[PDB]
Amino acid sequence: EAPTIIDLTCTVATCTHSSDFGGVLTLTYKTNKNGDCSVHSHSNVATLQEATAKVKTAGKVTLHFSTASASPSFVVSLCSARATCSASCEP
C-alpha cells in the first residue's frame, strides 16, 4: 500500500516562466513510511517534469515544472494528498 501523506504543503523555490523546466518546488509532508507516490497536476498553467516520487519519512520531495505564466498556481497531488503550488516568477 501507498504511503499515507499528511499536511502536504508546497513551496516554489524558484520560478522562471520559460519553455524548459524553469520551476523548482518542494513538497513538505508527514508520512508513515518510505514508498513510491505518483505526482500529478492537471493545470492549463504548469506542467510537472515528474510522474513519481520516492517519498521518505524526512518529509520533503523536490519536483520540477514548466510554466508560461508569471503568476502560476496549480494543484499538485502526492499519492492521495493535494496541495496548491503558487509563485510569482521571472522571465
Swiss-Prot record:
Residue span of region E1-DIII:
6-86
| Entry's localization field | Virion membrane; Host cell membrane
Q: Where is this site: Interaction with host receptor VLDLR?
A: N34, D36, N44, A46, T47, K54, K56
Effect the entry attributes to changing T28K? In strain: A7
The PTM entry states: Stearoylated.
What is the recorded phenotype of mutating K54A? Answer: Complete loss of interaction with host receptor VLDLR
Membrane topology of this protein: Single-pass type I membrane protein
The record gives the effect of mutating G59R as:
In strain: MTV
Got any disulfides in this one, which pairs?
Answer: C10-C85, C15-C89, C37-C79
Query: Which superkingdom does the taxonomy of this entry point to?
Result: Viruses
Q: Which residues form a coiled coil?
A: none
Q: So what does this one do? A: Class II viral fusion protein. Fusion activity is inactive as long as E1 is bound to E2 in mature virion. After virus attachment to target cell via host VLDLR or LRP8/APOER2 and endocytosis, acidification of the endosome induces dissociation of E1/E2 heterodimer and concomitant trimerization of the E1 subunits. This E1 trimer is fusion active, and promotes release of viral nucleocapsid in cytoplasm after endosome and viral membrane fusion. Efficient fusion requires the presence of cholesterol and sphingolipid in the target membrane.
Q: Quaternary form?
A: The precursor of protein E3/E2 and E1 form a heterodimer shortly after synthesis. Processing of the precursor of protein E3/E2 into E2 and E3 results in a heterodimer of the spike glycoproteins E2 and E1. Spike at virion surface are constituted of a trimer of E2-E1 heterodimers. E2-E1 heterodimers interact with host VLDLR or LRP8/APOER2 to mediate viral entry. After target cell attachment and endocytosis, E1 change conformation to form homotrimers. Interacts with 6K protein. Interacts (via E1-DIII) with host VLDLR (via class A repeats); this interaction mediates viral entry into host cell.
Please state what the annotation says regarding this protein's domains.
Answer: The E1-DIII domain binds the host receptor VLDLR.
State what protein this is by name. Answer: Spike glycoprotein E1
Which taxonomic lineage does the organism of this UniProt entry have?
Viruses, Riboviria, Orthornavirae, Kitrinoviricota, Alsuviricetes
